[PDB]
Amino acid sequence: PEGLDQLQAQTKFTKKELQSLYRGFKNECPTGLVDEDTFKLIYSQFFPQGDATTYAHFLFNAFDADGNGAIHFEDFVVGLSILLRGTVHEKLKWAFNLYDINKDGCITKEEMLAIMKSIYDMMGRHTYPILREDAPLEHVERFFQKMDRNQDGVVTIDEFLETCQKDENIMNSMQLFENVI
Ligand SMILES: [Ca+2]
Ligand SMILES: [Ca+2]
């Protein structure tokens, strides 16, 4: 059908790259539509060992567009644009949205604690001797003390930006750590 050329018109890509991203979605999910459950199967294939189950759910929230639980290849191609054609700013927004799934739109050292636990349970790598054992607290503590501050108590995209912007190497490290995920 003309569902192809049409999608291309919306997205900002060439009929070539468009037909490419489409095939990938058809090769990784020759079913038609995608669902939360599937999203898990995807991250599972690229990361079988470990958990990734909790973080997988959070990932879904990142995608989608004010819709229900059923997604498609479109919203997926668009995201690709955010990652492909997107500077650190757009990324900061995408990463910030991930660190949040509950109501409201603010962050807190609490929600951050649960996030660290998820990544901690996912860390299935630990070969070779290692001294440091575990301490997901000191980290979330320095991050909140460095960013969180205003009376609002909770960190918002603003407070977040104010930090990641006037940052020196803090949020920069976060990106390096997120690069793996
Ligand atoms: Ca929140
Ligand atoms: Ca705050």
Short structural description:
The protein has helices at residues 3-10, 15-28, 36-46, 53-62, 74-84, 88-98, 109-122, 136-146, 157-166, 170-180; strands spanning 34-35, 70-71.
Question: Any descriptors?
Answer:
mainly alpha; Recoverin, domain 1; 61% helix; binds calcium ion
Written account of the structure:
With 181 residues, the chain is an all-alpha fold. It has a single domain, classed as Orthogonal Bundle (Recoverin, domain 1). Helices cover 61% and strands 2% of the residues. The protein contains ten helices and two strands; from the N terminus they run H-H-E-H-H-E-H-H-H-H-H-H. Strands 1-2 form a two-stranded antiparallel ribbon. Helix 7 packs antiparallel against helix 8. The two termini are 36 Å apart. The site of one calcium ion has 8 residues, from loops. The PDB classes it as dna binding protein. Keywords: EF-hand, calcium, LxxLL, DNA binding protein, dimer, Alternative splicing, Apoptosis, Cytoplasm, Endoplasmic reticulum, Golgi apparatus, Ion transport, Ionic channel, Lipoprotein, Membrane. It forms a monomeric assembly. The entry is titled "NMR Structure of DREAM". The protein: Calsenilin. The organism is Mus musculus.
